[PDB]
Design a protein around this ligand. Structure first.
Ligand SMILES: Oc1cnnc(SCc2ccc(Cl)c(Cl)c2)n1
Length: 133
């Protein structure tokens, strides 16, 4: 029951400061433009200890399956090859991605009927809000 309140199908409804976050990450111009348009469907499910997060979008489709605390390989929508570790901290999913000596942290939390995603790269944060699809 660890992630019950995350499970479901979610649709992106707002994004703030995502271009600046992507710039901080190192995403190039064309990818930032096309990625910034997308309104993905995020589909979260749990089967035993395995959590799956899928993103269905007009830009890219992605999928990760993982066990909390256990590092895995991830290919991000912008085509970074990262090493990821996801934990639960006080009911927040905390996802750290490491690549090329860099690090970014993505937090996903339930707030009211929304799922709020905060993406942080150094001093730059983007907030992406999802509602149930
Ligand atoms: O909206 C969401 C929901 N869950 N995780 C994320 S991860 C942030 C992300 C997404 C797409 C691109 Cl292209 C880049 Cl650079 C980074 N974002």
């Amino acid at each position: 029951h660890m992630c019950d309140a995350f499970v479901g199908t979610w649709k992106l409804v707002s994004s703030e400061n995502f271009d600046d976050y992507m710039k901080e990450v190192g995403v190039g111009f064309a990818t930032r433009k096309v990625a910034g348009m997308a309104k993905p469907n995020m589909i979260i499910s749990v089967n035993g200890d395995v959590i799956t997060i899928k993103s269905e979008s007009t830009f890219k489709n992605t999928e990760i399956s993982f066990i909390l605390g256990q590092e895995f390989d991830e290919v991000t929508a912008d085509d970074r090859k990262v090493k990821s570790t996801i934990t639960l901290d006080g009911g927040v999913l905390v996802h750290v991605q490491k690549w090329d000596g860099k690090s970014t942290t993505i937090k996903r939390k339930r707030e009211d009927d929304k799922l709020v995603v905060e993406c942080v790269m150094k001093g730059v944060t983007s907030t992406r809000v999802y509602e149930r699809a």
